[PDB]
Write a protein that binds this ligand. Sequence first.
Ligand SMILES: C=CC1=C(C)[C@@H](Cc2[nH]c(/C=C3N=C(/C=C4\NC(=O)[C@H](C)[C@H]4CC)C(C)=C\3CCC(=O)O)c(CCC(=O)O)c2C)NC1=O
Ligand SMILES: C=CC1=C(C)[C@@H](Cc2[nH]c(/C=C3N=C(/C=C4\NC(=O)[C@H](C)[C@H]4CC)C(C)=C\3CCC(=O)O)c(CCC(=O)O)c2C)NC1=O
Ligand SMILES: C=CC1=C(C)[C@@H](Cc2[nH]c(/C=C3N=C(/C=C4\NC(=O)[C@H](C)[C@H]4CC)C(C)=C\3CCC(=O)O)c(CCC(=O)O)c2C)NC1=O
Ligand SMILES: C=CC1=C(C)[C@@H](Cc2[nH]c(/C=C3N=C(/C=C4\NC(=O)[C@H](C)[C@H]4CC)C(C)=C\3CCC(=O)O)c(CCC(=O)O)c2C)NC1=O
Ligand SMILES: CCC1=C(C)/C(=C/C2=NC(=C\c3[nH]c(/C=C4\NC(=O)[C@H](C)[C@H]4CC)c(C)c3CCC(=O)O)/C(CCC(=O)O)=C2C)NC1=O
Ligand SMILES: CCC1=C(C)/C(=C/C2=NC(=C\c3[nH]c(/C=C4\NC(=O)[C@H](C)[C@H]4CC)c(C)c3CCC(=O)O)/C(CCC(=O)O)=C2C)NC1=O
Ligand SMILES: CCC1=C(C)/C(=C/C2=NC(=C\c3[nH]c(/C=C4\NC(=O)[C@H](C)[C@H]4CC)c(C)c3CCC(=O)O)/C(CCC(=O)O)=C2C)NC1=O
Ligand SMILES: CCC1=C(C)/C(=C/C2=NC(=C\c3[nH]c(/C=C4\NC(=O)[C@H](C)[C@H]4CC)c(C)c3CCC(=O)O)/C(CCC(=O)O)=C2C)NC1=O
Ligand SMILES: CCC1=C(C)/C(=C/C2=NC(=C\c3[nH]c(/C=C4\NC(=O)[C@H](C)[C@H]4CC)c(C)c3CCC(=O)O)/C(CCC(=O)O)=C2C)NC1=O
Ligand SMILES: CCC1=C(C)/C(=C/C2=NC(=C\c3[nH]c(/C=C4\NC(=O)[C@H](C)[C@H]4CC)c(C)c3CCC(=O)O)/C(CCC(=O)O)=C2C)NC1=O
Lengths: 132, 49, 160, 160, 162, 172, 172, 87, 161, 161, 22, 173
Amino acid sequence: QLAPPGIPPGEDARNNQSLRQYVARPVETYQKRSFATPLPLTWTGETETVGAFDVVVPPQEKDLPVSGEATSAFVKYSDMVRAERKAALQALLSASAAGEGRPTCGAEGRKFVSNANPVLVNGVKCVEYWRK
Amino acid sequence: DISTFVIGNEIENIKIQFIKGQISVKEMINALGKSSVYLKEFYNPYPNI
Amino acid sequence: SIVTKSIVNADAEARYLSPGELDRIKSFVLSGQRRLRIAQTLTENRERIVKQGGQQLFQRRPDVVSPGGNAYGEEMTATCLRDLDYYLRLVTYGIIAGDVTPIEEIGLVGVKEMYSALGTPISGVAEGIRCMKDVACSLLSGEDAAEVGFYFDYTLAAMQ
Amino acid sequence: SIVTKSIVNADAEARYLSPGELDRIKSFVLSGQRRLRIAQTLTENRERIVKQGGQQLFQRRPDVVSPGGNAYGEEMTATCLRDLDYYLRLVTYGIIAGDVTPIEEIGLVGVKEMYSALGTPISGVAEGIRCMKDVACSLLSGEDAAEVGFYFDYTLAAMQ
Amino acid sequence: MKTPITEAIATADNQGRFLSNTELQAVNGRYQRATASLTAAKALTGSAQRLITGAAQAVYNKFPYTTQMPGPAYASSAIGKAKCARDIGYYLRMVTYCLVVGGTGPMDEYLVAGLEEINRSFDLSPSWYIEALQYIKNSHGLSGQVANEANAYIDYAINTLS
Amino acid sequence: MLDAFAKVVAQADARGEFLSNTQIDALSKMVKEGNQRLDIVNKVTSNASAIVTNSARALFAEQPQLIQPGGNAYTSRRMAACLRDMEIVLRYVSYAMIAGDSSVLDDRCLNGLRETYQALGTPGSSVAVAIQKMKDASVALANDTTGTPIGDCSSLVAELAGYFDRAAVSVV
Amino acid sequence: MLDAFAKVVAQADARGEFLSNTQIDALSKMVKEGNQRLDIVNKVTSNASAIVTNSARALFAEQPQLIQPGGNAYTSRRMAACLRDMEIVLRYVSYAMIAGDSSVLDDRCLNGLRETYQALGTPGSSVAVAIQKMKDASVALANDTTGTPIGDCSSLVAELAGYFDRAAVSVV
Amino acid sequence: ANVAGQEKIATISGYTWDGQPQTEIPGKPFVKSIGAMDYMDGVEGGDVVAAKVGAFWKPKAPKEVPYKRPMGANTPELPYNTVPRLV
Amino acid sequence: MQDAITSVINAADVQGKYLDANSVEKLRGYFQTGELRVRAAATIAANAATIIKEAVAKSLLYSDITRPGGNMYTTRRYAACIRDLDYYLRYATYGMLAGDPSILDERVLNGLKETYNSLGVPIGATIQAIQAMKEVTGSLVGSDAGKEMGLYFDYICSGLS
Amino acid sequence: MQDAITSVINAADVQGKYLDANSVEKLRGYFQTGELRVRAAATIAANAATIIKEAVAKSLLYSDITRPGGNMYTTRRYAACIRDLDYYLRYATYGMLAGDPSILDERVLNGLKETYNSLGVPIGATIQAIQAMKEVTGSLVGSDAGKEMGLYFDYICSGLS
Amino acid sequence: SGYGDYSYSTDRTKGHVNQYYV
Amino acid sequence: QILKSTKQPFLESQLRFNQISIKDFIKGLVLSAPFRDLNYNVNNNYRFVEICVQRVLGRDIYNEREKIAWSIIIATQGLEGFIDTLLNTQEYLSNFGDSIVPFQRRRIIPQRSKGEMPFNLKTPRYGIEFRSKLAATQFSWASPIRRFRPQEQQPKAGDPALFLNMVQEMGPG
Ligand SMILES: C=CC1=C(C)[C@@H](Cc2[nH]c(/C=C3N=C(/C=C4\NC(=O)[C@H](C)[C@H]4CC)C(C)=C\3CCC(=O)O)c(CCC(=O)O)c2C)NC1=O
Ligand SMILES: C=CC1=C(C)[C@@H](Cc2[nH]c(/C=C3N=C(/C=C4\NC(=O)[C@H](C)[C@H]4CC)C(C)=C\3CCC(=O)O)c(CCC(=O)O)c2C)NC1=O
Ligand SMILES: C=CC1=C(C)[C@@H](Cc2[nH]c(/C=C3N=C(/C=C4\NC(=O)[C@H](C)[C@H]4CC)C(C)=C\3CCC(=O)O)c(CCC(=O)O)c2C)NC1=O
Ligand SMILES: C=CC1=C(C)[C@@H](Cc2[nH]c(/C=C3N=C(/C=C4\NC(=O)[C@H](C)[C@H]4CC)C(C)=C\3CCC(=O)O)c(CCC(=O)O)c2C)NC1=O
Ligand SMILES: CCC1=C(C)/C(=C/C2=NC(=C\c3[nH]c(/C=C4\NC(=O)[C@H](C)[C@H]4CC)c(C)c3CCC(=O)O)/C(CCC(=O)O)=C2C)NC1=O
Ligand SMILES: CCC1=C(C)/C(=C/C2=NC(=C\c3[nH]c(/C=C4\NC(=O)[C@H](C)[C@H]4CC)c(C)c3CCC(=O)O)/C(CCC(=O)O)=C2C)NC1=O
Ligand SMILES: CCC1=C(C)/C(=C/C2=NC(=C\c3[nH]c(/C=C4\NC(=O)[C@H](C)[C@H]4CC)c(C)c3CCC(=O)O)/C(CCC(=O)O)=C2C)NC1=O
Ligand SMILES: CCC1=C(C)/C(=C/C2=NC(=C\c3[nH]c(/C=C4\NC(=O)[C@H](C)[C@H]4CC)c(C)c3CCC(=O)O)/C(CCC(=O)O)=C2C)NC1=O
Ligand SMILES: CCC1=C(C)/C(=C/C2=NC(=C\c3[nH]c(/C=C4\NC(=O)[C@H](C)[C@H]4CC)c(C)c3CCC(=O)O)/C(CCC(=O)O)=C2C)NC1=O
Ligand SMILES: CCC1=C(C)/C(=C/C2=NC(=C\c3[nH]c(/C=C4\NC(=O)[C@H](C)[C@H]4CC)c(C)c3CCC(=O)O)/C(CCC(=O)O)=C2C)NC1=O
């Protein structure tokens, strides 16, 4: 090859060094010098930089007025819960029952708990296979 | 570790005596278990069972 | 949601789901794109929907904010708007769940016990949600704000 | 106290209490009249014992109160005296309990972990208790100053 | 830092030679003055809290707009008032470092290098800190050559701010 | 250093061909948006000390251990070098906005800045937080009208936020 | 480069604290030694040509391969560079004696020196033998009376011997 | 480690903020600075108030008795024309 | 009793925050598979008796639990099995639609292994019946739908173990 | 006690198959972040005492758990906290390196909330201490590394809740 | 269980609850 | 390090009055007291040769033996003989002479987009060696201001203080 970096070839100081006092030459390369740093390519038509013609401002709350199988899907949907809900709406209002018991929370807190879902307490029916 | 339930003055008797090599591990554990740091934690608040 | 109580309905009856139940889970998930667009409108309009919600509430019920009202002073009025931010949030849950099941077990079950026990006029908080409804439906079209409308008036119904 | 650890000593040894243990529970309870008088002196002298306690502490350790010291400013200096009020209180417990058992499991066990973790110089707080000791023993006779000072220097020993 | 000791090493190091008798005399003169210097640093430390709370009050008496004007730069809040007394304590702490070391080396390194760029950026005024240091110069209570050494480093800070 | 006009020439040169008719028309849109690009840069350099100082003040409120004794921005000199870094990054982000290409920003500002902070011990995660505070302080002063005619500068403030994000990623 | 007095200031600035009362009393003992710390620096500077040359001559008598052809101290330029290195390590030990702190010694002299002698081929185990011979020539000359008043300088020649031991283990 | 430095007992070379070990000479880790304070006596438990290390009731002897004598049968062995290596 | 939408709303509500991009990101993932789950639950409803008949004949039909002394000998005991296996194939259908196995431990798993130990029902043969029932369910609904329905079967088998 | 590689090997082994493209695909994803985790665990080891001192002073040092009667009054009780907070900052460092939170519930989470209820330790103040400790940890290690270390803090807070 | 030990009732302490204004 | 603590106003006055040249101004900035405090006292003799070759001669160190060869000028002649030897090389006088300020010579190739990492970024004022003795820290111990009660400056999520001021509108309109 050559000498190592910096060593004038032929003026080494470890030529006839004794082995008993020989010190191993440390390894040093041309990395940490700046001449051997890899630059951007830039003759193959590629610069590493970025600027205009890069950045796009994408609106991604607003992709478009959303697809037809969301609205055409939709308007089918609440044609099929509309009869449900207003039946369930004034099932609340003139279900204006009286009051039992003593008010345990201020003035409310009577026998039944307010707006409690009856399907939960009433939907789990215990059943005996071969009921007897 | 001894840190949050000792005061500092309890078992430095045993540590320095062990770091110097004067006592082996088993003496260090036996002297550790029969110190009042142990019965203040594992003997006082529990029954004999 | 419509998915969970269409299941627990057919769960109790020892049967699977009928076409009437499975053509609506099907119809609901194709509706899911349109639901997130509606809840997305109310999500970052809470500054105006709540602020302007408490706008008409005090103009219609000055007693609750006047001295002696429950929401009197700088303190209670802040909490006075805090509850409206709660109920506006639950309506966003009901729109995405396709049902008032999220609004049912949060903010509706036993709500009269809380507000009676807090000294708050429950009719007054019902007036607050109605004022939010006119602001919310003014932010949306045609049918959309119709589904996300039906959820406020359900909360109005259960809150009295 | 002397009563509780003379018990737990003889408790561990599977035996009752010897005359050496029962002639000292006896000797301690007859000492109880004189102990409450001593603790009664320190009880309503905390205004002077603490404030003059922090007097000599800052004159001897101006670093802790100087800018950069741990107790710098109006804030930390108030807490700077708060700890001295704590340790002066525990000494009143030790005098009535006849032992540093109250001072042991309060303010002594793991004290270096706290003050090291607070950035406080533990040697500095030891200097504070010594300044309180000279004020405390200056308030009592020689027979009492051999006790009230006696509990401070134990706190000095465990605090370094 | 710039001490009397390191300015003697540096004089010998700048030419590549050993410490001559020129440099031993400069180190000896540090040891004669250090008796008055280490009793001034001990006394400024011992009365540091009563000197900082007094000097912050001297700034608010002379410049009362700093407690009334809204804005981040002023001590018109409890957070702004704690940061003012933090700064008085920075200036007093560097003085007792210069008395211990024996030269204007700690506050050259920690305080005065880059100080003009901060006061321009954060809208602080060097006349606030001159008034705070003129209080400490008149209220530390020292006398003799102990007060000569303490005032020699307080006047070094007033000359950099002005 | 090359701007947006010189990058489409440098890429067409490695192909050895003239610019097309749609490549001239895409550059004629960048000439028509030139006065609005010149008012993004005019607003972030006429307020350069307010972008830097208000964002530094917001950083030591959020990360108050940087100005504690022993900390990273604790002295007068480490505080002045901290504001020097925020003023340098805002200088080279503003250079990349008038060019349209982030070439000068990483040729001579971001070139080796991550390994400068590692040899020094400076926390690069906190420098990225400081850049993100200078970003939204700069895009808030970009889309306010205040002496400009009304129009759409929406794709220009998206590009300006892109150079601020490029600098904050390249530092940690 | 900072002395014994500026070392305790730099340790207290990292905590942001004033000096303790025991820290100031321990600096008043270094002032009290004083005159005799300056006696040790005066005694190893007035003999600095003879510390180096007598312990160089003693080094090539025990290790004769160092001056054999091919050895590391064989030529005129390589021999004059061994005596130049012994005179430099003796220079920065006397700087660290007058400062009371090994901070001028291991920033200016000892930092990077082990990796430098390995790049040159210089046997660092033999440099350490030449440093330990200058140590014995210095501590035998530190505690002779010869124009000084009689007293106890034993805690200061234990510090001078500690600087020579630090330079001799950091060279290999 | 912070208590020992804060107490002026001894400064313990720790880690820099990214976690590399501290060192005064860049060869090996945890090397410390020394001088005018590790050889000075009487401040061993310095700033630990009322510390009692060793015979605190008496000043120690001067002990300024430096002489090296002929160490028969234990003068250390090492090679000639050499200097010993190590791994 | 929460579905995928209920669980997403609960976690987003339990922190008091709105439905951010991450919460809606999973919700969109559930709506994408909404078409697959209904058809999976469609065919399972049709072939409920056929699936259970295939599982028992493939796993535990002729083993000696079926013979005298085995755990399934008497006709009441045999009839309890297909009644019992019907719940596993039914509740697993509910978990497949709801996209969340909360209904299983709410209504099936709790007190289940503690009940079989009382009756002395062999948990080992039970899981293999469900495993075989999981194997036939992947036949009908396909691969990915079988992956979905199969994901709740072993959830039952895991907790029942 | 499994890392990301152990969990990938277990799932690929539990089906008896080799490491296919999907199993190695996640393993390559873990090796890419291997450089980030060590530097994250590097600075956390350096500033362990500083992070815990910052969290307690920012969350629960100004409160009435610190005052008499509060849960942290006596010096033994205060010293137990920073001992206790050290494990959360330490074990979270292990999860950040291993890339899998299995070590947390194996050695921290199990019997933890059941232990604090025994002692009467407030779980509410504990999580906010860890949340504040998570906030300072994002300061040191950066954003994405804070996202990694932060991903195991709330795992502790979730299970400890 | 000691000279300083915790009981829930004597805790008079907004820390099991966390209204951070106290 | 361009601070007015580090300005040299009398070197500047002798340059404006044509007394010294730019070669004497460049020499006076290396031998100045801010350059010895901030740069020379935080490097060893080998990395400081790398700093002064990159900033005075305008080019990079050739290899690790050029650093060794020049670092013995600082140890035996001091810093004043090292910058006289560097300024009197023919590499300096052919490029800058005595009237031109130095620069980084030939950093970027004419058609490329990137450069070669400018020298103030390649070597900062301290490095890996010396960095450990004097870096800074992150969170030391200093007992800072306690910010007092501190959540509460960022209200926690449920809580009705985020709507304070929005209560404000409430009246009239
Ligand atoms: C006291 C005992 C003692 C020794 C044995 C030698 C050992 C020794 N040999 C070499 C050095 C060498 N040794 C060889 C050896 C050989 N050449 C070949 O091609 C064959 C493999 C073999 C011949 C038989 C070579 C080529 C070199 C030169 C290496 C080089 O310069 O690259 C070196 C390096 C220094 C130098 O350049 O000489 C040392 C220490 N030296 C001693 O002091
Ligand atoms: C004979 C009458 C007749 C029509 C009017 C259309 C009507 C129509 N449009 C779409 C569907 C669509 N059509 C478009 C097209 C566009 N969107 C835009 O913004 C652009 C203007 C334009 C492309 C250039 C898109 C994007 C969809 C998908 C909508 C969605 O996202 O769901 C579909 C469903 C799939 C498809 O076939 O595309 C149908 C049937 N088709 C017909 O057979
Ligand atoms: C030397 C400095 C220098 C400048 C700053 C500009 C200043 C400038 N800007 C505009 C012109 C303009 N400037 C803006 C910019 C904006 N409008 C907004 O609402 C946003 C806040 C902002 C985006 C950045 C717009 C939108 C126009 C065009 C107005 C239109 O729509 O016609 C014009 C008139 C020419 C034209 O209309 O094209 C001029 C002279 N030119 C210069 O030579
Ligand atoms: C050139 C440098 C230099 C100095 C040191 C001082 C010189 C100096 N040293 C001492 C004073 C002294 N010098 C010594 C030193 C020693 N005695 C021994 O037997 C040891 C061999 C040696 C220590 C290594 C002692 C011990 C004293 C004090 C006298 C005593 O303790 O009896 C005094 C007397 C002043 C006094 O005691 O108050 C003076 C002027 N000035 C200078 O310019
Ligand atoms: C998600 C469902 C939900 C609701 C609704 C709810 C109710 C609710 N409202 C409260 C108080 C309160 N709420 C209000 C609000 C009002 N007062 C008025 O004047 C008006 C009529 C009304 C609003 C329109 C006020 C004033 C208080 C404080 C009452 C008091 O201090 O006594 C509180 C106690 C305070 C607190 O938690 O900090 C609760 C829990 N919390 C919930 O989680
Ligand atoms: C009963 C046993 C007992 C003790 C001793 C105790 C100490 C204790 N000291 C504290 C703070 C403190 N303590 C100090 C103390 C000092 N500064 C100085 O310069 C002096 C050396 C020293 C006092 C003499 C300071 C400055 C703080 C506040 C630290 C900070 O704000 O960061 C705190 C945190 C705030 C608080 O809750 O009070 C506790 C818990 N707690 C206990 O239960
Ligand atoms: C150790 C060397 C050192 C010095 C000298 C130093 C000064 C210093 N003072 C500052 C702020 C400050 N300084 C003050 C002080 C005052 N304002 C007033 O109205 C009072 C009259 C006056 C008290 C004398 C205030 C209120 C701030 C906060 C200003 C802001 O936040 O913008 C800041 C801005 C960063 C921060 O908010 O902490 C620095 C860097 N920092 C250092 O590290
Ligand atoms: C023109 C292109 C260019 C860039 C980008 C650049 C960065 C750069 N910033 C530096 C230092 C610095 N950078 C900071 C910055 C910070 N520390 C913090 O804690 C904050 C998080 C943060 C900003 C607020 C500090 C404090 C230093 C001083 C480090 C020191 O000298 O100890 C240094 C060290 C060299 C010196 O001070 O002499 C360089 C080279 N230099 C350049 O020439
Ligand atoms: C940090 C303060 C500092 C030191 C200490 C230093 C040493 C240093 N010693 C060198 C060479 C040398 N050093 C030695 C020394 C020795 N070889 C032996 O065999 C003996 C064991 C030992 C003498 C006791 C020799 C022989 C050379 C010449 C190597 C050569 O010519 O290639 C060189 C190469 C330049 C030259 O001398 O021509 C430097 C830079 N440089 C510095 O900046
Ligand atoms: C590695 C997984 C692991 C953890 C986490 C663990 C916790 C643990 N925390 C304990 C106590 C404790 N923990 C605390 C903690 C606190 N007080 C507060 O106010 C805060 C909310 C909180 C600090 C964040 C306190 C005060 C005690 C002492 C309780 C007592 O003495 O009654 C104890 C009792 C024994 C002892 O500390 O020696 C254990 C075993 N053990 C483990 O193996």
